[PDB]
RNA sequence: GCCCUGAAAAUGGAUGGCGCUCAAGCGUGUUACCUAUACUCUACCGUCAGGGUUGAUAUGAUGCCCUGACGAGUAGGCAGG
């Protein structure tokens, strides 16, 4: 009642809870998604070999 | 050309000094040698630029790592402590 829900309006006049600018807080799962993984090129060595 | 005369100032006095006369002087030529915080190569610190790396089961993706270049400073500005 005090702060409101998705089906109940908040008792505060004209107030709604703030929105999210990102859907989830774990970007690891977003990267590990099939669509992202199927569009990227293979990665490197993570520690480049010294050539000269 | 060199040297000499012309050429007199006040504390004692300065090719920097000693001293030097086929010079250790003057003109000219040939080599060797000495040494700057400059140049060349290397290491280390920092700054700037271009890049690599999220895949869990280990901690900083403002992380870790690869590559190149650069570094004087009053008044003054900005940044990290
Ligand atoms: Mg001579
Ligand atoms: Mg030097
Ligand atoms: Mg310099
Ligand atoms: Mg400086």
Curated annotation (Swiss-Prot):
Protein name per the record: Large ribosomal subunit protein uL4A
Entry remark concerning the domains of this protein: The eukaryote-specific C-terminal extension harbors a nuclear import signal and delivers the ACL4-uL4/RPL4 complex to the pre-ribosome, triggering uL4 release from ACL4 and incorporation into the 60S ribosomal subunit.
Residues represented out of the complete protein: 260 to 311 of 362
UniProt function note: Component of the ribosome, a large ribonucleoprotein complex responsible for the synthesis of proteins in the cell. The small ribosomal subunit (SSU) binds messenger RNAs (mRNAs) and translates the encoded message by selecting cognate aminoacyl-transfer RNA (tRNA) molecules. The large subunit (LSU) contains the ribosomal catalytic site termed the peptidyl transferase center (PTC), which catalyzes the formation of peptide bonds, thereby polymerizing the amino acids delivered by tRNAs into a polypeptide chain.
Post-translational modification: N-terminally acetylated by acetyltransferase NatA.
Effect of residue 30 to A: Leads to an inefficient release from ACL4 with a delayed assembly into the 60S subunit
Quaternary structure note: Component of the large ribosomal subunit (LSU). Mature yeast ribosomes consist of a small (40S) and a large (60S) subunit. The 40S small subunit contains 1 molecule of ribosomal RNA (18S rRNA) and 33 different proteins (encoded by 57 genes). The large 60S subunit contains 3 rRNA molecules (25S, 5.8S and 5S rRNA) and 46 different proteins (encoded by 81 genes). uL4 is associated with the polypeptide exit tunnel. uL4 interacts with its chaperone ACL4 and the nuclear import receptor KAP104.
Lineage top rank: taxon: Eukaryota
